[PDB]
């Protein structure tokens, strides 16, 4: 599928920066973060037009292989056929997803993991560089 | 095991840039490139103080879990307690490895892979940035 990375050992307060390019005719791309594939503290899925959603960011969690309750945001700062950088961090309370443009999204830390060791991109999103700063 | 990456889909003539921090007391580190843990087109192992070797870059291949013929490099452009970057590309003849001070050596591609989809880092070398030019 798309890029998968393990043993990131990302601790709270630390910054995970991902730069990638969006497909010209993109429907949906996702960035998954957590312990492994079945334990996602952050399912970041901007939907241009997929699953009945149009220009909407759908965030969710997964614990023990089971999806949590979807959270949906108002603004949709992503554009098809472009480069998008995302900076990700987390506390004991929230996952924080920042964009350079000034957009900042938050998602509740439902899994309360000690660290982020997993990252995947199952969508129309070709990762070009990943920084662990 | 350290940072492991899958589904890289690196085609011939495309660059893989890895920037990281060499530990102050670094003994050795490893960069594994190929299809999986059993199939490596490049085993890149700079040995500062490991296996009786000192300041020697050890290169090898792994095919079907079987190590190929080991090749060592004369020069050693790595200093412990510093930041080093490695740029790796290939064709179906050679792996090209570029080192932090302009040094450049080739390693035979003895697996003839259609693409590199697996990277595994280990040892005294914390990754900071992985790019895919
Ligand atoms: C009731 O079915 C579900 O409806 C919601 C509301 O539109 C859909 O969001 C949901 O689609 C799936 O959402 C999850 C995240 O909650 C994933 O993004 C999944 O994509 S993927 O991981 O397979 O790529 C969406 O298909 C939909 N279906 C399910 C299975 O919950």
From the CA of A68, give the closest atom in ligand 1: 16
Cα separation of A2 and B117, whole Å? Answer: 10
Structure tokens at B125: 């070398």
Q: Tokens 């899994």 correspond to what residue?
A: A111
Provide the 8-state DSSP code for A124: S
Q: Which residues of A touch B5 (CB under 8 A)?
A: 3-6
CATH number of the domain where residue A90 is located: 2.60.120.200
CB of A43 closer than 6 angstroms to any ligand 1 atom: yes
Contacts of A63 (CB under 8 A, 6+ apart): A39, A110, A111
The per-residue DSSP string of B43-99 comes to EEEEESSBTTB-SEEEEEEEETTEE---EEES-----TTEEEEEEEEE-SSEEEEE-
* Domain extent for A59: 1-133
Cα separation of B2 and A103, whole Å? Answer: 32
Cα separation of A103 and A117, whole Å? Answer: 25
Task: Check CB contact of B5 with chain A, cutoff 8 Å.
Answer: yes
Task: Say if CB B88 and CB B104 are below 8 A apart.
Answer: no
Q: What backbone phi and psi angles, to 5 degrees, belong to B103? A: -70, 145
Cα separation of B98 and B88, whole Å? Answer: 6
Minimal C-alpha gap between B72 and chain A (Å)? 29
Provide the 8-state DSSP code for A25: T
Q: Give the residue among B16, B12, B73, B68 at the shortest CA–CA distance from B38.
A: B68
Q: H/E element holding B132? A: strand B125-132
- Does A45 appear as a known binding residue? yes
Q: Number of helices and strands (H, E) in chain A?
A: 0, 12
Task: Check CB contact of A132 with chain B, cutoff 8 Å.
Answer: yes
Task: Say if CB A76 and CB A55 are below 8 A apart.
Answer: yes
Cα separation of B36 and B16, whole Å? Answer: 17
Cα separation of A87 and A13, whole Å? Answer: 12
Q: How many structural domains comprise chain A? A: 1
Query: Cβ A131–B129 below 8 Å, yes or no?
Result: yes
Angle at CA of residue A40, ends A37 and A43, nearest 5° = 105
Q: Which of A1, A2, A3 to mutate to test the interface with B (most CBs of B within 10 A)?
A: A3
Q: Which long-range contacts (CB under 8 A, 24 or more apart) does B88-92 make?
A: B88/B15, B88/B16, B88/B17, B88/B18, B88/B31, B88/B33, B88/B42, B88/B44, B89/B12, B89/B13, B89/B14, B89/B15, B89/B16, B90/B12, B90/B13, B90/B41, B90/B116, B91/B12, B91/B13, B92/B12
Measure A67 CA to ligand 1 centroid, in angstroms: 9
């Amino acid at each position: 599928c798309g890029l998968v990375a393990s043993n990131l050992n990302l601790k709270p307060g630390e910054c995970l920066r991902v730069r990638g390019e969006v497909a010209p005719d993109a429907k949906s791309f996702v960035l998954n973060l957590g312990k492994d594939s079945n334990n996602l503290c952050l399912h970041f899925n901007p939907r241009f037009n997929a699953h009945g959603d149009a220009n909407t960011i759908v965030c969710n969690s997964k614990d023990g292989g089971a999806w949590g309750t979807e959270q949906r945001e108002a603004v949709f700062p992503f554009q098809p056929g472009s480069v998008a950088e995302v900076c990700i961090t987390f506390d004991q309370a929230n996952l924080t997803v920042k964009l350079p443009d000034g957009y900042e999204f938050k998602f509740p830390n439902r899994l309360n993991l000690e660290a982020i060791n997993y990252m995947a991109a199952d969508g129309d999103f070709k990762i070009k560089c990943v920084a662990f700063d």
